Amino acid sequence: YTPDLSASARTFHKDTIYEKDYQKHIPELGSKPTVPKDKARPYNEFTKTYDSTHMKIP
Amino acid sequence: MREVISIHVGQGGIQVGNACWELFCLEHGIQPDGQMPSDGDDAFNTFFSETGAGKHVPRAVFLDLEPTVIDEVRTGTYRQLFHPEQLISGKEDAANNFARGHYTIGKEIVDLCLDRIRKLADNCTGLQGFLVFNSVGGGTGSGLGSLLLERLSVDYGKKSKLGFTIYPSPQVSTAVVEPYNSILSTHSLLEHTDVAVMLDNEAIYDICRRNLDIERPTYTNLNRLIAQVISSLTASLRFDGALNVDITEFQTNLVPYPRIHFMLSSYAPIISAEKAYHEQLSVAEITNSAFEPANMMAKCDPRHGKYMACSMMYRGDVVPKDVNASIATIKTKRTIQFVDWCPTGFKVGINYQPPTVVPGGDLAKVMRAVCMISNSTAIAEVFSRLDHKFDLMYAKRAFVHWYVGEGMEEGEFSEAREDLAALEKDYEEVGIET
Amino acid sequence: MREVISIHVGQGGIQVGNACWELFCLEHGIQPDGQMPSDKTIGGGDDAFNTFFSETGAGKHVPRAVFLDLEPTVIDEVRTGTYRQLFHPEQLISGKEDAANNFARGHYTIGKEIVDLCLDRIRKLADNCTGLQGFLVFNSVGGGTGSGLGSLLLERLSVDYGKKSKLGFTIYPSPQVSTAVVEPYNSILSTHSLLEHTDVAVMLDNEAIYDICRRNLDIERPTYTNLNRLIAQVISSLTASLRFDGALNVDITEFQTNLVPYPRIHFMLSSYAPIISAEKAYHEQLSVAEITNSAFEPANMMAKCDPRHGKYMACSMMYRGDVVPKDVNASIATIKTKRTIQFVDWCPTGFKVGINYQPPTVVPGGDLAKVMRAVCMISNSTAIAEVFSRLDHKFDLMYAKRAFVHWYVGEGMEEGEFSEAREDLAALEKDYEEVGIET
Amino acid sequence: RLQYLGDKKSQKSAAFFRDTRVSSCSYISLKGGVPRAIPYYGSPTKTYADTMSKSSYISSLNHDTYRVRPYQHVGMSQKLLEPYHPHSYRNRLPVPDAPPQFSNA
Amino acid sequence: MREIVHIQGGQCGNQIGAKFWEVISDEHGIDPTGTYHGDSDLQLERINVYYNEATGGRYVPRAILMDLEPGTMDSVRAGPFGQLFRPDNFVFGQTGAGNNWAKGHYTEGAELIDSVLDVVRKEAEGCDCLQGFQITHSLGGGTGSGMGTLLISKVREEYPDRIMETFSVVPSPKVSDTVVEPYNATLSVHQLVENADECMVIDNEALYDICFRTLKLTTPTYGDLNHLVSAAMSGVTCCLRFPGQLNSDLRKLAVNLIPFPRLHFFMIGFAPLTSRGSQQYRALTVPELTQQMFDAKNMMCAADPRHGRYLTASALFRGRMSTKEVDEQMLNVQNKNSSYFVEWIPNNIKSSICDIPPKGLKMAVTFVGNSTAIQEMFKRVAEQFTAMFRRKAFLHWYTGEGMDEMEFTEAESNMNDLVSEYQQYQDATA
Ligand SMILES: Nc1nc2c(ncn2[C@@H]2O[C@H](COP(=O)(O)OP(=O)(O)OP(=O)(O)O)[C@@H](O)[C@H]2O)c(=O)[nH]1
Ligand SMILES: Nc1nc2c(ncn2[C@@H]2O[C@H](COP(=O)(O)OP(=O)(O)OP(=O)(O)O)[C@@H](O)[C@H]2O)c(=O)[nH]1
Ligand SMILES: Nc1nc2c(ncn2[C@@H]2O[C@H](COP(=O)(O)OP(=O)(O)O)[C@@H](O)[C@H]2O)c(=O)[nH]1
Ligand SMILES: [Mg+2]
Ligand SMILES: [Mg+2]
């Protein structure tokens, strides 16, 4: 019984692009950033803080 | 409606800030060239300032008397982002002479920098505060960093301070003259800042080594983790959350005494994707992970002394019930003990946005984490080690002349060890029972 | 009103005694000159220092100690030492010629001309004391001057005072490495005189100290001072209850009635641990059994002897600090249950427990140091008779050739006395063999 | 300093090797009329005080033996330097006593 | 931007100079004709440091070649790389020095100092902010030590603030190339102590020992010795021309290399070196680099650093390496070599990082360290004078310039105690 096969032996990696489940979700380096979804402080009333009407109070 | 102006000085400060801003930049979708792709949201104002045409100019200040490091950015890809005339670069460097960087060569530029900073505050009105990064074991930062620190206190006065310092490595140092310029920098910043941090570079390596298992890391990655530290700091400032912690709510919950404003900070978890597959990464387990001294960001073991304060900002998908269930667990362990007079020192905050990973980063994507800024009397050792060094090279007047000839008087050196000597007793006196 | 007088003869006692007193004055807050600083908290609380010192009425303190040695060099060092004022100048009796390890000189030729001043010295020293529990004698058997001064002096106190209890912490020569070449002779004869005139004998062979030192101390380059800071801390807990409050008082007197089952069997050995130091201080906890278990460890005894080769007759242990003794029974409870630890058939109970409250203090910083635990035993094991074998056989190994015989015969000591030491020493083994035999 | 220097006064003495063209050093002693010549650069010379052959030590065993050798422990600020050894003297875990309960109990 | 200048004098000082510009011309990608052909855009950003802008797009070195004999300067320009130097900057007379320190400082060299002082001032004034002068010369030679030093002495009276360098090839007693080798060096040496901020001592014996031993070369020629010394030059300013993680100008080194104001004599070494027949058989990486650089024999000073203790030391690693590995090796070398990073100044080793490796190699370092081991060189080398002084003479070739005895008996009075300054700061302890 000869050694089964050199090509089927334990290879520290094989030819399966993503050889493991590891890199399937690893971020792409060159990918453009994605704007965050609707997750932040909702904004109405401080509108009346930066407006140019506050000064000149008297 | 809240914005913070950043002051990055010293070769580290611009470099260390280098890594952090992308995380600030990337998390808002702004392109490197100063544009956002068509898609709360878009309120980058927390760090940026919209001109009205699309560009987002960060409210950061770049200073260094040595053009080299500064030259690395305006020639880099990020050239188009920052305001051009807002980058102040000096001609002659301080060459690690604190006196030079604090007495002679920095004064002629102070007006320009003081001019720029003042301008950046006009646009905003609800400015929470300023974050200044300066390396104590650095020449240009030691002096220039202090001088700006001194001025604002008379430039604005009461306005708070949040400065991230990087003290010298506990044992493996780069320069030799660090003990001198380190002490004086402490003296100026000891009573002219509000909150400090312990950013010894030795801490990251073990964290980078033990966790990332990168036996050959460089300074670029170390900043990345530090950058992560800041991100969780302002997390409650530009994201919706049930419990929010702001800068103005810092002296109230982290300052047992006006003098004592030097604590240590940490973050977790530092895990690569290769080991997080077989990990639960449960909120409970991560809770203890940021308490073991192995994962701390300062080369100090809290088991040496008591604990005076612990403030927690939770970021991710944690739930308050587990935190309290997890928080209580810490009150049971006997290896970590508080002070006799600290009944309540816990601060727990929950923000809905989990960590964001920049492309090419080392940290993997997780579901929970923690960052910490805790008050413990353990800070005594770090200064104590310096105390031993300071006298050793002055009992024979080593290197004294180099300092004397640049305008620093001989009597300035003694007070530094005088102020430090008082400081050490200040921490010890607040660690015993009544 | 209790006072104890410590007698030092021989350099080894000259040095080893130094470590205890220096720690003492450091334990009682006594300055090198003997002047107690009033700036210290409170002061003059009852009479705690009275055990070892003697007040002059206004000022310094006078420890009840005596120094003896035939060679000036050892004495001269003390008088010029930094504590040259801590001891009474008239108490430093010094001779003119050393014994140089021979018994006949320090006991029959030149040692007889010195016993007069010291004996008078103690009488004046003993006169001050009103509740004298006894006397402490420190000396090394590995020298004719020691054994010569120990043998001749000790017997005197037997008749001069009579029933006064006397404790002797002898330091026998090592099984394999001995400073001198005639170590067996002085030890062989020395036990004779002290055979019926010493109350307690604590086996403290030096090499065992290093083994503990080489296993816990971890100082690859130790000096005698390293040894000194070990023994000196030992005495502090031994008489601990004699100078501090304790739940169940343990005094010097109630020892022979607890460690002397038979008139001849009065050789004892002690154990203590842990150690405080400079590369093991994560100071953090462990528990008692560890301190007790290490107490009974074969390698933790102050003798190069294995109690696995013998049986246990009586025991005594000492602690310090502040907790509830309740762990003692259970901690001891795990002791007897151990099969490696055995008792004799006629010993229903063989443990004596005495615990005080005062923690351990260390010179800054010691060689031991301010340990958190403090466990020390006062117990006896038959195995030490063997490891007498080392002394017995080698001593035989020489006389057969009559080697170095004339040296002792040059001082008028007859050739015949050598027989008796073998006789009495030989008879010594018989009882131990018979003592351990079950009925 | 120390370093060296030249000699530079030629037409002075010895009356014969004066101005004898031959690289002959400076001049010829002839004080005794015998052997060794003047042994171009020096050394700033030395005196008995400069070289005293420092004694191996200055003090005795007992001074260090009974040195006035605070009790270091966890933290407690300064820790004196000592040789490194991993079997441990003051960085490891302690053990805290099991002492008694006073009174008749 | 913070550019510098170079003044090399004497035939010895000139020959070393002949290659450094040869070495520098390569790093910036410049061939002999003076035209730019480089490869990397970083190659050219920091080019102003050593060249001045000129018409036609050609660059010329900011160099002043100074000599008193005609052959040397006549020699260089007709050889390869003979076009770079500006013809005007040359200066020479019609007399020569003739290794007579007297003639080179009072009679002939004195009269011509006007021109060299004339040219030097102009070029320095041109630069936007003069970083400092680096002076290379041979104290064993006449014009270098004799007249060259004075220029070093004089220039201090005009520019008190800028810092100085000296790549002085002090001769060693083992193999002396001149009988005067030991009345020109020190008299230039004595004046050197009071003005020279720093001093590099390169001993010939080290070069021959360096060449024969490690390089495994059979028949080297001075071209071999010159370049190895020149390579050291690029290390001093290497980080001054390219960006890096940790930069340190020539000022920053000055702060962290001189324990006391006057003790400013160092010893340097260059690594790594391997023979032609040995390159493949060696795995080059960061940790075995330290073995070579810290080895005593690698030093270019005849003194053995094992004769004394190191006061302070700095190293500039060349080649792109991370930050972690650089520090750690320092910790072990300090602890393992603690006996020498003596004991009253903790961690006396400085660190630098640069990311431009020498063309054709992936890791190399430059060494600049201060150790009392330099004491032997100022003790033994020509120590014969102390005995050979007693007989007063050789004078007639030096009083021909008005030099008197008092100028000599005074020097040790000023000069007696260098080691007596260096020796004391070698046994002291807290
Ligand atoms: N943690 C960390 N520290 C850095 C980094 N870069 C520089 N440093 C610090 O910088 C110190 C070295 O000194 P320099 O960086 O040259 O100090 P400097 O900012 O240049 O100040 P000047 O010399 O006056 O210009 C080291 O001890 C580090 O603590 C970095 O990337 N990460
Ligand atoms: N463990 C220990 N033993 C000591 C010390 N100093 C002396 N000794 C003992 O003293 C012995 C040396 O014997 P000797 O030098 O003859 O001393 P002696 O018995 O008084 O006889 P003489 O010196 O002639 O007076 C050694 O075997 C030691 O056991 C010490 O500091 N530690
Ligand atoms: N390493 C090295 N040494 C040199 C070189 N040229 C000359 N020397 C040394 O310079 C010494 C002679 O210097 P000298 O000719 O008097 O200098 P000059 O008076 O300016 O011409 C000799 O001992 C040589 O060792 C060189 O190219 N390389
Ligand atoms: Mg800098
Ligand atoms: Mg003796």
Author numbering:
A (entry chain 0G): 123 to 180
B (entry chain KM): 1 to 39, 45 to 439
C (entry chain NM): 1 to 439
D (entry chain 5D): 19 to 123
E (entry chain KN): 1 to 430
How did the manuscript describe this experimental structure?
At the core, motile and primary cilia share the same cytoskeletal framework, the axoneme, composed of a bundle of nine outer doublet microtubules (DMTs). Inside the DMT lumen, a weaving network of microtubule inner proteins (MIPs) stabilizes the DMT structure. Acetylation of α-tubulin at the lysine 40 residue (αK40) by αTAT1/MEC-17 acetyltransferase modulates microtubule properties and occurs in most eukaryotic cells.
Our first observation is that all the decoration of the MIPs appears intact in MEC17-KO and K40R DMT compared to that of WT. Therefore, our cryo-EM analyses indicate that acetylation does not affect DMT and MIP assembly. We measured the inter-PF angles in the DMTs of the WT and the two acetylation-deficient mutants. We observed only minor changes in the inter-PF angles in the A-tubule. Most notably, the change in the inter-PF angle between PFs B7 and B8 and B9 and B10 ranges from 3° to 6°. For two K40R replicates, the inter-PF angles have minor changes in the A-tubule but for the B-tubule, there are several PF pairs with significant differences, especially in PFs B7B8 and B9B10.
